[PDB]
Amino acid sequence: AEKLGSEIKKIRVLRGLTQKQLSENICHQSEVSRIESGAVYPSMDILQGIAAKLQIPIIHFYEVLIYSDIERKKQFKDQVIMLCKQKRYKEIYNKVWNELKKEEYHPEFQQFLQWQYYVAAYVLKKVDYEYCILELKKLLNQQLTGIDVYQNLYIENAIANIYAENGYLKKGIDLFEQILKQLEALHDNEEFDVKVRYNHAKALYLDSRYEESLYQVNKAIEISCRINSMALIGQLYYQRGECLRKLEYEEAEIEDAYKKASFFFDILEMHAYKEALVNKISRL
């Protein structure tokens, strides 16, 4: 909203024609100022009248508007991703609902919002898993693909997690397999790569495919190190530990993987994840 006027200030100042000369077009001096502050978005025609006085090419304001809108939206995705990581779903639900409430036409961004809405509903208990999955699949079979090639895969990752955590381990696995297959093809966005491999390994672990699980976990660690990310690495070492214990590797290599998990937990002040860990080492 406020960039249009801000770039109108920048330019009219450098043009060399007065702010009250830009008044005598189609509006009071006031409207120019209210536009100047972003307060009022100018009407299509008034703007075209202003487009006569600072030079200037017309597509330069649309240019302006498009960067400001992509940044607006990118900033919102960033913010939403940020609360997901913090598990703040009541806030996610509210935020995305309010954005959808505007019902503005932008199919890909609306898909992003709905994905987040249905998942948050799910976490918040507003909706069954069966229902959440349905809704999520209606998204895949819009079969869109804008600027974000990964968005369907993200939506697929959610579908597989809900299945896996609700007992449907073979469906979830097949799905994780689909995703990895589409990632080998695309690229790159390796944090996600790591994340699907982490869930895949969990589901493999609960299906007693321990080597398979361990393979996937080593691979995810390897990727975590190549993109420099500690996002899931501590829990990758936790999972590595669990696999090496069900496969009965030397206590040494087992406890090793676990101290490392422990290191990341403290380093990352991940107190929930840290708790369980100190439990097991005595317990099991």
Binding site: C84, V119, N157, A158, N161, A164, E165, K195, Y198, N199, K202, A203, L232, Q235, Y238, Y273, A276
Partner: peptide, 5 residues
């Protein structure tokens, strides 16, 4: 631990 969204 939990699955990761």
């Amino acid at each position: 631990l939990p699955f990761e969204f």
